[PDB]
C-alpha cells in the first residue's frame, strides 16, 4: 500500500477519532453513525469496535484502522447493506448523489470541504461522467477490490 494511501486512511481516521486522541471509541463511532442518520445500539457499537480492535483494549487505534482498511479479501455485502449505504448519500431519494448531497454529508462529519474537493470526490466514483453518482456507480466503489 502506497504512502499516500496511508495518509488517505489517516484522514478517514480523523473523521471517527473526533477528540483526536488516537483511538476511536464506541461513543465516537456512535456519533459518526448518528451523523449519517443511522442509529446503532450500544451493543452494536461494541460489536463493530471489537471486530477491529485486534488487541482487545476497547478502542481502535490507527494501526488497527490501517489494518482494516488495507486488508480484506473479496467477499462483500448484500445489495441491502449497499442500498442503505447509498441512501445515506442520496438525501433527496432521486437515485443520484450530487456534489451538494456529498458536501452536506461531509459537513455533518465535521468536514470543511471546498467545491473543487467535492467535485474531485464525485470524480472518483462517477463513471458515465454525468457529474453525479448513480447506484450502479455507487456499488462499484463499494464492491470492487
Amino acid at each position: 500500500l502506497t504512502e499516500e494511501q496511508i495518509a488517505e486512511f489517516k484522514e478517514a481516521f480523523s473523521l471517527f477519532d473526533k477528540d483526536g486522541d488516537g483511538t476511536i471509541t464506541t461513543k465516537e463511532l456512535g456519533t459518526v453513525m448518528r451523523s449519517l442518520g443511522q442509529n446503532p445500539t450500544e451493543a452494536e457499537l461494541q460489536d463493530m469496535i471489537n471486530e477491529v480492535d485486534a488487541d482487545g483494549n476497547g478502542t481502535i487505534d490507527f494501526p488497527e484502522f490501517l489494518t482494516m482498511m488495507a486488508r480484506k479479501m473479496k467477499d462483500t455485502d448484500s445489495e441491502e447493506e449497499i442500498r442503505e449505504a447509498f441512501r445515506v448519500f442520496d438525501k433527496d431519494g432521486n437515485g443520484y448523489i450530487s456534489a451538494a448531497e456529498l458536501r452536506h454529508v461531509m459537513t455533518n462529519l465535521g468536514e470543511k470541504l471546498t467545491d473543487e474537493e467535492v467535485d474531485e470526490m464525485i470524480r472518483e466514483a462517477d463513471i458515465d461522467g454525468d457529474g453525479q453518482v448513480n447506484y450502479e456507480e455507487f456499488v462499484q466503489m463499494m464492491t470492487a477490490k
Partner: peptide, 17 residues
C-alpha cells in the same frame, strides 16, 4: 477524504462480525 476511503471505512467499520 477520498470517497473511496470514507466508503471503505464506513463499510468495513459496520461489519459487526
Amino acid at each position: 477524504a477520498t470517497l473511496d476511503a470514507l466508503l471503505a471505512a464506513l463499510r468495513r467499520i459496520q461489519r459487526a462480525d
